[PDB]
Amino acid sequence: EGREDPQLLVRVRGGQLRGIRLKAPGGPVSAFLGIPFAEPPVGSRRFMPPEPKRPWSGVLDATTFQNVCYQYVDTLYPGFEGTEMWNPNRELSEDCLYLNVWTPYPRPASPTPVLIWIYGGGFYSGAASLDVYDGRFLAQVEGAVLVSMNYRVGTFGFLALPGSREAPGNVGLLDQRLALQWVQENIAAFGGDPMSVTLFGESAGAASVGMHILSLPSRSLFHRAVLQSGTPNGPWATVSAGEARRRATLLARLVGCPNDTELIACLRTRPAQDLVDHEWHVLPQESIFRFSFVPVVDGDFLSDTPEALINTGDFQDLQVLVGVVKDEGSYFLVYGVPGFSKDNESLISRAQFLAGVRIGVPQASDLAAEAVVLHYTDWLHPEDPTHLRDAMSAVVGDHNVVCPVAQLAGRLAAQGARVYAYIFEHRASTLTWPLWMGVPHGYEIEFIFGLPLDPSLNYTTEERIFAQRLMKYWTNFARTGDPNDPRDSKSPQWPPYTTAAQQYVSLNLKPLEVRRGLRAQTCAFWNRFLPKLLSA
Amino acid sequence: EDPQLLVRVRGGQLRGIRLKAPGGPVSAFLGIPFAEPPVGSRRFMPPEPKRPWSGVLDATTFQNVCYQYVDTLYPGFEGTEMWNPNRELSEDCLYLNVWTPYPRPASPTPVLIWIYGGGFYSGAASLDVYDGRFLAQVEGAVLVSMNYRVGTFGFLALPGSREAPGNVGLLDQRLALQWVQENIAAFGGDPMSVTLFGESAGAASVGMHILSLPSRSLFHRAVLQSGTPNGPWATVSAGEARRRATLLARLVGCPNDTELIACLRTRPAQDLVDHEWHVLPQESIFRFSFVPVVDGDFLSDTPEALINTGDFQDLQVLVGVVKDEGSYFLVYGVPGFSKDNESLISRAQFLAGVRIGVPQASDLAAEAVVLHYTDWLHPEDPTHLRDAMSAVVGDHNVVCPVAQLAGRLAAQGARVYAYIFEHRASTLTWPLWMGVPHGYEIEFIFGLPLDPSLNYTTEERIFAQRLMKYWTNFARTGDPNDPRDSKSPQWPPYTTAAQQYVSLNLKPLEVRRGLRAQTCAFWNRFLPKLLSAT
Numbered sequence A: 001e002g003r004e005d006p007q008l009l010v011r012v013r014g015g016q017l018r019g020i021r022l023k024a025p026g027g028p029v030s031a032f033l034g035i036p037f038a039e040p041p042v043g044s045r046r047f048m049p050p051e052p053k054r055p056w057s058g059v060l061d062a063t064t065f066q067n068v069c070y071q072y073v074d075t076l077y078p079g080f081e082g083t084e085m086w087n088p089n090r091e092l093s094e095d096c097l098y099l100n101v102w103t104p105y106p107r108p109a110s111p112t113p114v115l116i117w118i119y120g121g122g123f124y125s126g127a128a129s130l131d132v133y134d135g136r137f138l139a140q141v142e143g144a145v146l147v148s149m150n151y152r153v154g155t156f157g158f159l160a161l162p163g164s165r166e167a168p169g170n171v172g173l174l175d176q177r178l179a180l181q182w183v184q185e186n187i188a189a190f191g192g193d194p195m196s197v198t199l200f201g202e203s204a205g206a207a208s209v210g211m212h213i214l215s216l217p218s219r220s221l222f223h224r225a226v227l228q229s230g231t232p233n234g235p236w237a238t239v240s241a242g243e244a245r246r247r248a249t250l251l252a253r254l255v256g257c258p259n260d261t262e263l264i265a266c267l268r269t270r271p272a273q274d275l276v277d278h279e280w281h282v283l284p285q286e287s288i289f290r291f292s293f294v295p296v297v298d299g300d301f302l303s304d305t306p307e308a309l310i311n312t313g314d315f316q317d318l319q320v321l322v323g324v325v326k327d328e329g330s331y332f333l334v335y336g337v338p339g340f341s342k343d344n345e346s347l348i349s350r351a352q353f354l355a356g357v358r359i360g361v362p363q364a365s366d367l368a369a370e371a372v373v374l375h376y377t378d379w380l381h382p383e384d385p386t387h388l389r390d391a392m393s394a395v396v397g398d399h400n401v402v403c404p405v406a407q408l409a410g411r412l413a414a415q416g417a418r419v420y421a422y423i424f425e426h427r428a429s430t431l432t433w434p435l436w437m438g439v440p441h442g443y444e445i446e447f448i449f450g451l452p453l454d455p456s457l458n459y460t461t462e463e464r465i466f467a468q469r470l471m472k473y474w475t476n477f478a479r480t481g482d483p484n485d486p487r488d489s490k491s492p493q494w495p496p497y498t499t500a501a502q503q504y505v506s507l508n509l510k511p512l513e514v515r516r517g518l519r520a521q522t523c524a525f526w527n528r529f530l531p532k533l534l535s536a
Numbered sequence B: 001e002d003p004q005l006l007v008r009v010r011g012g013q014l015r016g017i018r019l020k021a022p023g024g025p026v027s028a029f030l031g032i033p034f035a036e037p038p039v040g041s042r043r044f045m046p047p048e049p050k051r052p053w054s055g056v057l058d059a060t061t062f063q064n065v066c067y068q069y070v071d072t073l074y075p076g077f078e079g080t081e082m083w084n085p086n087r088e089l090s091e092d093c094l095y096l097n098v099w100t101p102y103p104r105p106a107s108p109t110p111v112l113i114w115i116y117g118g119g120f121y122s123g124a125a126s127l128d129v130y131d132g133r134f135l136a137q138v139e140g141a142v143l144v145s146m147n148y149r150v151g152t153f154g155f156l157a158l159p160g161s162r163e164a165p166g167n168v169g170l171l172d173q174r175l176a177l178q179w180v181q182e183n184i185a186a187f188g189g190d191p192m193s194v195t196l197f198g199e200s201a202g203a204a205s206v207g208m209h210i211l212s213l214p215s216r217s218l219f220h221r222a223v224l225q226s227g228t229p230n231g232p233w234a235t236v237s238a239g240e241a242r243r244r245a246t247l248l249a250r251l252v253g254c255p256n257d258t259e260l261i262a263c264l265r266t267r268p269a270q271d272l273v274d275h276e277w278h279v280l281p282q283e284s285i286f287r288f289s290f291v292p293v294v295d296g297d298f299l300s301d302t303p304e305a306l307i308n309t310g311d312f313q314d315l316q317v318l319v320g321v322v323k324d325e326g327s328y329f330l331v332y333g334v335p336g337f338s339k340d341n342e343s344l345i346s347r348a349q350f351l352a353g354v355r356i357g358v359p360q361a362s363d364l365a366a367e368a369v370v371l372h373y374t375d376w377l378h379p380e381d382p383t384h385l386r387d388a389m390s391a392v393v394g395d396h397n398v399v400c401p402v403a404q405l406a407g408r409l410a411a412q413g414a415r416v417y418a419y420i421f422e423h424r425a426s427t428l429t430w431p432l433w434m435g436v437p438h439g440y441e442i443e444f445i446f447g448l449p450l451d452p453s454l455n456y457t458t459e460e461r462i463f464a465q466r467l468m469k470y471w472t473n474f475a476r477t478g479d480p481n482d483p484r485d486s487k488s489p490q491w492p493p494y495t496t497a498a499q500q501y502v503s504l505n506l507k508p509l510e511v512r513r514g515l516r517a518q519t520c521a522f523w524n525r526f527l528p529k530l531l532s533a534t
């Protein structure tokens, strides 16, 4: 109002905003960062569902990222880029429910399809402000309207005493839902089309996307979904009400909080850091790829277990894109499996492999664990250290990601959904993790968001072209529900995943290759046999 | 009279017969008695040595076949009839046969002793596929084969009783082995170089002689073709043998052990055979009612226990399998399988078939088998399901037991050689979907393709000669490799480390590693736990 462009001044339901003009390699983009979408969930509102942001007066400055939700900070490899890139990059606070919007500059004069990013982090970490989630490239190159929101993690987002009024659980997912409702009402002010909203997320964010697919009140808030290396089904994304209650009760005892009302009231008096300092002490077994406070089967947000909901759900008018990276498990081994480190080749003995299986499959009986060991052992070389190391990675990746994804894709396809499946096989030339980890969990994200287009990041030219291809796949799917370009038949086609043919594509520097069966043989072990075994 | 055909053994004089092989004559001494006829009160009893005889005993023709069930699945079909008795049935059946080079061997010659198979309920040494003609003529071997009692007559047991102690059919084999030690030198054979070889139940028999101390002094090397003493069909516990014997007695109207066996001895042979199959505890295939029993005597413990703790240092063993061990048995009980159609089966038929092929499996173990063998890219393809049904039966009953035995023998001192036989005879009468069925390597080991009237291909003739050389080289030296040939390539010993075996087909030897390693880990390591826990 005076000297402000004014292509950066926008009004939303809550009031006026002032965004910022950012520089992307190919031109400018508009960014509206740190938009509050909820009342600060602090004090008496800790553990409570979010309340919509009450209107503010004057022009709110939306030129910088807001606080990151309070969370545990990783210190396994202090100062190491491979881990620090995921750590908070803004102040930790319980006052953290803000979202961000990237659009073309000038804003589009025509309703534009919207992408909503939901970050992962095992439901205990993450932030929409991380560099790998920078929406400026998708906004500039593909003309997308990209939105990303913070949501409460850890105890603050998922500590639950099911049935209580003061800690009903799943409030972190309700934070996400409120952001989705904010987009429905307000994204038109930015040139976005609320009738074309695609959710995409990775790890716990993909599991979050799946929970919105499975929760009725969320289905009216989006039209398509992308689940990258994560699912609502599987062994880590949810807990039962009984397990959530015992974990919340134990944590309370561990911070000096011995009726649900009095217990939660006492928890609300504790400092945020006190809860973070003990949240990892409530897991029932020594484990990797397990997180203390995750979505709970409350019979409300989730009317039943994700397994039961995907086994019996109707997904006719639903298009979904799902996939995995080549080495889903390797990242998690250095966080608790003896013998595994980023600083050596991590060749392990057979004994270390058996011990690792008990940690990677913590819920397994002795017989189930033995079944795993026999299945993954190479009986031509049962003691080879290199194969055992790679087998340990496959156990963790198959159990937690690949086979849950394969299960989800199969059920969704059988029950009306249009599914596209991929495996991501390119290892970034810039990767700082060792070679034995291969293509680890989470390292497709930087290519989807188009970071290789930033010339200062020293990616290769082939990786730049590769990123543009993936951006086109993702935005084409967002636009049409089909990753294939409407008129580019020269390039090979990406067929839908079906129960009959089970076709998926490999994403690497070569053109698309069609393959059949997402670890079909191995995932029969995890998804068909092992349930029968454990229940006996 | 021909003096090459006159032989004096400890019992008396024998007269053999000059037979014609493709390349020249051989001396055949057929139907030599090695035991007193196990008839009347000697039914179910251990064998006794044959009493001496006067004059010259005629040994020019095969003797009777031990009384046994006769197959009627495909009447008149060559594929089944080639295994049926080709001489009259009789309980008076304990005779053996000797083939030698004509003239007699000038120096002591290694001896090959054949033990026929047939599920311990059938078989005979007089079958055309066991013709010692060619091995004697071409390789100069002294070949011996004996009849042993089968079915109830050979293995009905009331363990602990005096009148039916069990395993008498194996004692028949052992007595023939003793006869060879005592007499084979009169034929030019070397009793200090005796090699046992057998197929199916015959191979299991060979293995039990390895695991029974009194037998170990009677041979020096062993070949086990598509059979093992360990595994789910070759032995039964004392309690199960007692159950099956008592049930058969009930079915034939009988009636303490003495009184029971006394009434069984009054029954005509066919009465017992008529109810032989009615005592199995489950509907099944590749299961036989009366087999060797873990008596604590002939077998001091289970074959599994004995191979796990035995000392096999100075032992050489040759083992192997055919490409499609299970196909033969499917047409004998599994719905959806016939020699006359391609036997394309549904998935439901596959689950039903698995309960018959793994009769002892719980519902959960059966599910484990189904899920392991299903191709989850084509879970309902009938061709794959049919071939998977054959693989289940073959792996469960032969391939993995063999891999188990080979590993334990190698680990505990034995020199082991392993093979897979992958050639389908041009003359085979079974359908193509059966592949290389159980038992159809034998005609090549014995050298039948060297007979031009049988219309084998000239490549199969050359192939047979190769196999006869492997087997006789192993008999001579404990090593199947030709000590004159140079890297064709070499047949390496099987070891727990490298797990090397060779493919036997029309192409030169190809060394491979791991005998269905992943699948036999399932059968040999996991499934016992799954059942040892229910």
Ligand SMILES: COc1ccccc1NC(=S)NCCN(C)C
Pocket (backbone or CB within 6 Å): A074, A086, A120, A121, A122, A125, A126, A203, A331, A332, A335, A441, A442, A443
């Ligand atoms: C954003 O998420 C990821 C990104 C890259 C690799 C792993 C994860 N996933 C988790 S949970 N990272 C936190 C550390 N934990 C393994 C203990």
Ligand SMILES: COc1ccccc1NC(=S)NCCN(C)C
Pocket (backbone or CB within 6 Å): B083, B117, B118, B119, B122, B123, B200, B328, B329, B332, B438, B439, B440
């Ligand atoms: C001599 O042995 C064989 C030779 C060829 C194929 C199978 C067998 N084995 C058995 S047991 N044949 C009897 C019939 N059985 C299917 C019940």
